[PDB]
Symmetry: D3
Subunit: 178 residues, 6 copies
Amino acid sequence: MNPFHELEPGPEVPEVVYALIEIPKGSRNKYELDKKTGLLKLDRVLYSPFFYPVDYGIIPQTWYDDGDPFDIMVIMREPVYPLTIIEARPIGIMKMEDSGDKDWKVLAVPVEDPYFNDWKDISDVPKAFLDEIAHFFQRYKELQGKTTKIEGWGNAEEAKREILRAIEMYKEKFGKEE
Amino acid sequence: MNPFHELEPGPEVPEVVYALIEIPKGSRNKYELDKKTGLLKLDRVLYSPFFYPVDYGIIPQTWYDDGDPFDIMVIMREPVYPLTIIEARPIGIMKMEDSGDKDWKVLAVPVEDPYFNDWKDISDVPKAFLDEIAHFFQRYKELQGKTTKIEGWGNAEEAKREILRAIEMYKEKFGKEE
Amino acid sequence: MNPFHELEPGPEVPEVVYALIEIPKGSRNKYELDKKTGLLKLDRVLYSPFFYPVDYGIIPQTWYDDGDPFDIMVIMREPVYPLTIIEARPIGIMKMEDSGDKDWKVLAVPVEDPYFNDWKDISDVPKAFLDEIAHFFQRYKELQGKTTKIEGWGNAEEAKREILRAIEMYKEKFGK
Amino acid sequence: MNPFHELEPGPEVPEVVYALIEIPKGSRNKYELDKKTGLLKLDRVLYSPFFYPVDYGIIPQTWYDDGDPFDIMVIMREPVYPLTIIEARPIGIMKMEDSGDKDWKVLAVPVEDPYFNDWKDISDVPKAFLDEIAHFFQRYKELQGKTTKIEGWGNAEEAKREILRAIEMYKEKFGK
Amino acid sequence: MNPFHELEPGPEVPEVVYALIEIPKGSRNKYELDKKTGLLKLDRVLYSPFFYPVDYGIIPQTWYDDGDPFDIMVIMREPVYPLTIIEARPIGIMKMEDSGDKDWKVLAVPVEDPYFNDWKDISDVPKAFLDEIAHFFQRYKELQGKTTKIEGWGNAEEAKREILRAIEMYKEKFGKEE
Amino acid sequence: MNPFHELEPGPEVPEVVYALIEIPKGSRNKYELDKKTGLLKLDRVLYSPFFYPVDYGIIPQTWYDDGDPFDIMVIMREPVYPLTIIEARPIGIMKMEDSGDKDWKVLAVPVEDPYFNDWKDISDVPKAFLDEIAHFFQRYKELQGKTTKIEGWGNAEEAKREILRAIEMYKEKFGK
Ligand SMILES: [Mg+2]
Ligand SMILES: [Mg+2]
Ligand SMILES: [Mg+2]
Ligand SMILES: [Mg+2]
Ligand SMILES: [Mg+2]
Ligand SMILES: [Mg+2]
Ligand SMILES: [Mg+2]
Ligand SMILES: [Mg+2]
Ligand SMILES: [Mg+2]
Ligand SMILES: [Mg+2]
Ligand SMILES: [Mg+2]
Ligand SMILES: [Mg+2]
Ligand SMILES: [Mg+2]
Ligand SMILES: [Mg+2]
Ligand SMILES: [Mg+2]
Ligand SMILES: [Mg+2]
Ligand SMILES: [Mg+2]
Ligand SMILES: [Mg+2]
Ligand SMILES: [Mg+2]
Ligand SMILES: [Mg+2]
Ligand SMILES: [Mg+2]
């Protein structure tokens, strides 16, 4: 019944994916999906007084180079609740290494918030906002002794290539028969 | 595992029903239950800076003329979280057409909040509050080009007739064997 | 000390003005600065479940055709508290009438939030956001039996010429 | 400017009074207006996980048997910010003693929230809500070793006669 | 699919247990897990303007003398959402009778909030905080006519004995085969 | 009335000081008291998704090496509103430089929250909490290109000697 395994990656992949939100914007508690049960679990409380700048979660039925479900960040005006499904349009991708692992993260906007109707690529996002997101990931685990390195941002096309790669990695990981 | 299908319509229908809340009072995000999975899903962000004036959701194992689960609005002092069950006493019904469809909505109070112990019928509700609810539905989809028409309010008896009709429509819709 | 009279209209008028916020984004309570004392006052509770879509207030030492200080709307990500001063860059103006009075409202962004650094004119705002603000003013007083008429949006140059006109109306009214 | 002394008790005393809110509904921090400066001050943090069930404050230019401004409770759907003025219609009065002093508290509704238009007397309030307010005052200082004694609720006519008495106590105390 | 039955009591019982949170700190709504479905349900609205001083919930696969899942209180700086799993370190136990029933409650801290790293026993908690918790339970059902009696606090060792007893009572209650 | 100048530094300096809060815990908006008028002003929005980990403000009638009122951080469970006065017991001091200026900050607890009754010195604070505060100041202005240097934490005795020094700097600056 774990929604990570049960939900499809999206209704029109990779143009529109499902984002399963784990962490609402504004939260200092780092939630994740419990792997066994699919419940929400507290992974940690962030060691610094930082908050997630985006709603944050995973794309169902994906896996990635870092040995986790593929991360997705959805820009929401009003945060959602954990375990909410958002139909999301990928617009770019944050390129980072986290303790040496290729922990990249899709950046997306909600299809059904008209505020974002003309946001289709990484160039549509205010620079200071991209900088704030990157800085969060650069520093949020500094007090835990972790080395993170932000490479930069890729465009919507690159995000979509990576989503398709992650859908394939899930099939290989869990032995899914086409 | 979709709670819309699994939960009973109520413990003492139609005098007391279960309200499965999708949208907490105060939310501009319009959540609904995903039909396939039963997870919470973002349907849309409202196009106007309005908020749901009531906790809003559905009665399990109901269906209605508009091709959806039967809508219920519960008056709560402190909003609940999405996917919370409230034992609710129907006190009236909002009569409206939404794009030509008979989209009526039960108005109810929580059985277990003593604040509302003497609220048993539509006449117990402040007029301005009924007007605020009606006005929300009159205008919340105006920027989406939708025609809605508020007819008025029915009493507790009429709400209860409609609940029993909706319980029957669900059985017919999903081929339930008595 | 009544901040409407004590504060200047801005540090670099009309390119940068001071916005004295009365109503934080997200409020359904309609607060105003009390004319007499300068304290925050509850004017009303909105009759509908609407909330202010922007941080809303006044430009100090202004007056306007509707017999009030000139209104200003500041787009803020995190709302401020009532009676907070924000250095604000006008980027456009909502043209409307309220109960038959000309009641236009400046739209502005905070100078000191870098998110908005490239917002300089009305074309920089998402359409749907302008539509949501206009719709709020179109309908928020409907249950009070009041009529508003929304004309549309003017640009930053219009907004600035209106700010100057409102500064001179304050001198006309209170000056001397 | 100390608003307790500067503001009038009301626009139409005792039918409509001004409530100067100190504590928004939902607070566990007990704020007061500082006697000296008129700024908001933290008096204490309540010793128990209780929150004020009403917007709580004072009527300006009043005094009372307990050596404080006369207390007022305003029922608000959305809480206000501290130091907000609310035009309030008294509808009853909580009769209690606090540490042996007569410390009654007016119960009022906002004139400008139409939700409360038909709330005019103590019989218009749900019983359970009156019970919750009384229980708050019965127990909120228990861990401080303080004794409160709740007598019961008086009606709107009592409340108004007490407001007039408190207005005259302010003149007795500060008058001249 | 009821997580009370599906989740294990903890990853390292009784030193570390899972706390399944029902009620976030700050809530006046008293939520519980629906027994049949595992959904969140509104049990009541508290009759007084009190709020839960701790995140409050249950340890999975436990049962207690009072005929309920064993209660656990987790001290969180930022409240979690209902149905969140917290890995929790027991540090003491609140001893109370509620309408004559032995309704004791584990007090615990999150393993993964470093703020609490040196909280290991009841003596690490500020006295006023223990007093506030006890006073809440002493008075929160006073308007419902219920007699509650707070005995005091036991230490971490006693809390852990009681957790193991509750794990056994669950096996006996639901006929679990070792 | 500008509370920075009007309020005294404390009721029992330096054992108990008045903290005039500018920024509630949890804010990303950086508010300050306006030097001119004493109103709350938005100085900036922090460039990163950081929030103030403490209620943050100033001690009235103090001045400091960095050309500002002396900063104070009050640990509060429930944040206060801006411009609230809190009676605060200093328990330590964050030693840092900001853009090359000595910009130390008192750490204090509220006298009137019994939760903190046994917090009297810097050793009473959880390590991780001191680390989180220091890290906030280490990184919160990084995207503004500003350099801060965190030296470490001093104890209650240091903090109190600094408060006295800051009280005398105010007299040096404004005195007369
Ligand atoms: Mg994750
Ligand atoms: Mg990682
Ligand atoms: Mg990853
Ligand atoms: Mg629905
Ligand atoms: Mg419809
Ligand atoms: Mg319907
Ligand atoms: Mg007008
Ligand atoms: Mg107007
Ligand atoms: Mg006209
Ligand atoms: Mg106007
Ligand atoms: Mg007294
Ligand atoms: Mg008293
Ligand atoms: Mg006496
Ligand atoms: Mg009194
Ligand atoms: Mg329970
Ligand atoms: Mg019990
Ligand atoms: Mg129990
Ligand atoms: Mg400096
Ligand atoms: Mg500095
Ligand atoms: Mg230097
Ligand atoms: Mg400084």
